[PDB]
PDB file of C-alpha atoms in Angstrom:
ATOM      1  CA  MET A   1      50.174 235.471 146.462  1.00  0.00           C
ATOM      2  CA  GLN A   2      47.138 237.264 147.915  1.00  0.00           C
ATOM      3  CA  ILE A   3      46.067 238.707 151.271  1.00  0.00           C
ATOM      4  CA  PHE A   4      42.878 239.278 153.266  1.00  0.00           C
ATOM      5  CA  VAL A   5      41.701 242.649 154.576  1.00  0.00           C
ATOM      6  CA  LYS A   6      38.631 242.317 156.789  1.00  0.00           C
ATOM      7  CA  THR A   7      36.617 245.508 157.261  1.00  0.00           C
ATOM      8  CA  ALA A   8      35.238 246.550 160.644  1.00  0.00           C
ATOM      9  CA  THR A   9      31.829 245.681 159.183  1.00  0.00           C
ATOM     10  CA  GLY A  10      33.018 242.061 159.247  1.00  0.00           C
ATOM     11  CA  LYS A  11      33.194 241.704 155.451  1.00  0.00           C
ATOM     12  CA  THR A  12      36.215 239.816 154.099  1.00  0.00           C
ATOM     13  CA  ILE A  13      38.042 241.299 151.093  1.00  0.00           C
ATOM     14  CA  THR A  14      40.598 239.230 149.165  1.00  0.00           C
ATOM     15  CA  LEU A  15      43.295 241.655 148.000  1.00  0.00           C
ATOM     16  CA  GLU A  16      46.309 241.410 145.682  1.00  0.00           C
ATOM     17  CA  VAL A  17      49.225 243.861 145.937  1.00  0.00           C
ATOM     18  CA  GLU A  18      52.928 243.941 145.062  1.00  0.00           C
ATOM     19  CA  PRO A  19      55.416 243.122 147.835  1.00  0.00           C
ATOM     20  CA  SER A  20      57.062 246.550 147.503  1.00  0.00           C
ATOM     21  CA  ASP A  21      54.247 248.848 146.360  1.00  0.00           C
ATOM     22  CA  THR A  22      54.046 249.934 150.018  1.00  0.00           C
ATOM     23  CA  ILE A  23      51.100 249.665 152.426  1.00  0.00           C
ATOM     24  CA  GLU A  24      49.662 252.580 150.436  1.00  0.00           C
ATOM     25  CA  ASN A  25      48.815 250.104 147.670  1.00  0.00           C
ATOM     26  CA  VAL A  26      46.751 247.984 150.066  1.00  0.00           C
ATOM     27  CA  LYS A  27      44.552 251.028 150.661  1.00  0.00           C
ATOM     28  CA  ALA A  28      44.464 251.948 146.964  1.00  0.00           C
ATOM     29  CA  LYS A  29      43.268 248.532 145.770  1.00  0.00           C
ATOM     30  CA  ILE A  30      40.386 248.740 148.248  1.00  0.00           C
ATOM     31  CA  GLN A  31      39.586 252.335 147.297  1.00  0.00           C
ATOM     32  CA  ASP A  32      38.188 251.030 144.005  1.00  0.00           C
ATOM     33  CA  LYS A  33      36.567 248.007 145.659  1.00  0.00           C
ATOM     34  CA  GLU A  34      34.769 249.426 148.702  1.00  0.00           C
ATOM     35  CA  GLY A  35      34.874 252.930 147.204  1.00  0.00           C
ATOM     36  CA  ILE A  36      36.115 254.318 150.547  1.00  0.00           C
ATOM     37  CA  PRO A  37      38.857 256.913 149.917  1.00  0.00           C
ATOM     38  CA  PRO A  38      42.128 256.950 151.893  1.00  0.00           C
ATOM     39  CA  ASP A  39      42.394 258.389 155.429  1.00  0.00           C
ATOM     40  CA  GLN A  40      38.838 257.222 156.142  1.00  0.00           C
ATOM     41  CA  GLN A  41      40.428 253.776 156.462  1.00  0.00           C
ATOM     42  CA  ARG A  42      43.274 252.438 158.628  1.00  0.00           C
ATOM     43  CA  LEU A  43      45.211 249.157 158.564  1.00  0.00           C
ATOM     44  CA  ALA A  44      46.616 246.918 161.307  1.00  0.00           C
ATOM     45  CA  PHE A  45      47.968 243.392 161.825  1.00  0.00           C
ATOM     46  CA  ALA A  46      46.988 241.412 164.936  1.00  0.00           C
ATOM     47  CA  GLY A  47      47.005 244.828 166.643  1.00  0.00           C
ATOM     48  CA  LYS A  48      50.391 245.876 165.244  1.00  0.00           C
ATOM     49  CA  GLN A  49      50.140 249.365 163.757  1.00  0.00           C
ATOM     50  CA  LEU A  50      50.914 249.219 160.048  1.00  0.00           C
ATOM     51  CA  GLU A  51      52.420 252.256 158.331  1.00  0.00           C
ATOM     52  CA  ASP A  52      53.187 253.275 154.741  1.00  0.00           C
ATOM     53  CA  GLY A  53      56.647 254.208 153.457  1.00  0.00           C
ATOM     54  CA  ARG A  54      58.046 250.695 153.925  1.00  0.00           C
ATOM     55  CA  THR A  55      57.941 247.387 152.033  1.00  0.00           C
ATOM     56  CA  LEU A  56      54.669 245.829 153.183  1.00  0.00           C
ATOM     57  CA  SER A  57      55.953 242.281 152.603  1.00  0.00           C
ATOM     58  CA  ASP A  58      58.863 242.989 154.951  1.00  0.00           C
ATOM     59  CA  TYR A  59      56.580 244.668 157.488  1.00  0.00           C
ATOM     60  CA  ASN A  60      53.871 242.180 158.507  1.00  0.00           C
ATOM     61  CA  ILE A  61      51.995 241.105 155.364  1.00  0.00           C
ATOM     62  CA  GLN A  62      52.225 237.349 154.774  1.00  0.00           C
ATOM     63  CA  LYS A  63      50.992 234.831 152.193  1.00  0.00           C
ATOM     64  CA  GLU A  64      47.187 234.594 152.350  1.00  0.00           C
ATOM     65  CA  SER A  65      47.243 235.968 155.902  1.00  0.00           C
ATOM     66  CA  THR A  66      44.628 238.145 157.610  1.00  0.00           C
ATOM     67  CA  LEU A  67      44.895 241.873 158.331  1.00  0.00           C
ATOM     68  CA  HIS A  68      42.563 244.174 160.268  1.00  0.00           C
ATOM     69  CA  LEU A  69      40.902 247.281 158.823  1.00  0.00           C
ATOM     70  CA  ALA A  70      39.154 250.214 160.517  1.00  0.00           C
ATOM     71  CA  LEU A  71      36.646 252.605 158.930  1.00  0.00           C
ATOM     72  CA  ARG A  72      35.104 255.981 159.794  1.00  0.00           C
ATOM     73  CA  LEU A  73      31.981 256.449 161.916  1.00  0.00           C
ATOM     74  CA  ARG A  74      28.520 256.580 160.341  1.00  0.00           C
ATOM     75  CA  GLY A  75      28.115 260.172 161.548  1.00  0.00           C
ATOM     76  CA  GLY A  76      24.720 259.494 163.142  1.00  0.00           C
TER      77      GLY A  76
END
């Protein structure tokens, strides 16, 4: 039903996407939440590189399972 994307800051974010809206949707639903635009973020699953252009539910996403997110540097 839902999923969990945990930022590199250690903050947990409960997310809700469609099974076939592509990984791109996982980044878009967080763009409004954390405000961080695309590209500045990156997704993974237990270390497995996730990629857009494929059905996320067929890729690695599972029911209420945990994913791993990476963000940009602070810059200073």
